[PDB]
């Protein structure tokens, strides 16, 4: 995350970091036994780590679970990344309280303007790589779908949306793939691409999570 603070130990209780030896994503808890992440992100070998703050020191709440099979979407498109979007099923189902809780999927789509929180362990710097230790945050409204396409020209799909500043200086960057983009308590995106980070004119695009809801719970009920 560029420009943005520390949560503080816990206060973004379903977070999860997608772990293989070191974190190479993050994801959302969204139930006791599934977490939604971004299919770019899929590699096999996963564990999942629950309850995190400093993810190289084990502080106490930390919950390190397998990942049982990971389902990425059948039309993710590897060139475009249009349906970025996996659920991962966990080995056993995680211990839910104030620490480890689930979010909340979606009844509508969020608006332009919405604020949302973004979150993530990923690189703090937009030149150059500095990787924190704790979760780390960032407030970011959602753009309208003019400003993005005319960012993004002919990479923009409906199932994506575009969020943050166009100033620069703000924005979710590499490591923070995978993970929540929360509005008014709603899992309104996953953290997909953008070009480079907080650029200026180049704002974060994020998985439309609205538009997978019927998938995802069908997915879900049948595995
Ligand atoms: C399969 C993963 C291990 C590799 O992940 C990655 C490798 C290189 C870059 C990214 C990445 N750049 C990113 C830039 C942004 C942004 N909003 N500007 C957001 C997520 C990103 N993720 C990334 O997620
Ligand atoms: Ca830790
Ligand atoms: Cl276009």
Redesign the pocket.
Same mark, same amino acid.
Do not use: I, L, M
């Given at each position: 995350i560029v420009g943005g603070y520390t949560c503080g130990a816990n206060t973004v209780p379903y977070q999860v970091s997608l772990n293989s030896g070191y974190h190479? =994503?993050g994801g959302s808890l969204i139930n006791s036994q599934w977490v939604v992440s $971004?299919a770019? =992100?899929? !590699?096999s070998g996963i564990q999942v780590r629950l309850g995190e703050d400093n993810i190289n020191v084990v502080e106490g709440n930390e919950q390190f679970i397998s990942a049982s099979k990971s389902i990425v979407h059948p039309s993710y498109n590897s060139n475009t990344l249009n349906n970025d979007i996996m659920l991962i099923k966990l080995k056993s189902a995680a211990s839910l309280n104030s620490r480890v809780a689930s979010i909340s999927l979606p009844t509508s789509c969020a608006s332009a303007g919405t604020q949302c929180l973004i979150s993530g362990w &990923?690189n703090t710097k937009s030149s150059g790589t500095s990787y924190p230790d704790v979760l780390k945050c960032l407030k970011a409204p959602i753009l309208s779908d003019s400003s993005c396409k005319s960012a993004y020209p002919g990479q923009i799909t409906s199932n994506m949306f575009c969020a +943050?500043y166009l100033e620069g200086g703000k924005?979710? =960057?590499? +490591?923070? @793939?995978?993970g929540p983009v929360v509005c008014s308590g709603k899992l309104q995106g996953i *953290?997909?691409? &953008? @070009?480079? =980070? $907080?650029q200026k004119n !180049?704002? +974060? *695009?994020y998985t439309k999570v609205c538009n997978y809801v019927s998938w995802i719970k069908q997915t879900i009920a049948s595995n």
């Open positions: 190479f =994503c $971004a770019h =992100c899929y !590699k &990923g +943050g924005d979710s =960057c590499q +490591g923070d @793939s995978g *953290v997909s691409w &953008g @070009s480079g =980070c $907080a !180049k704002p +974060g *695009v």
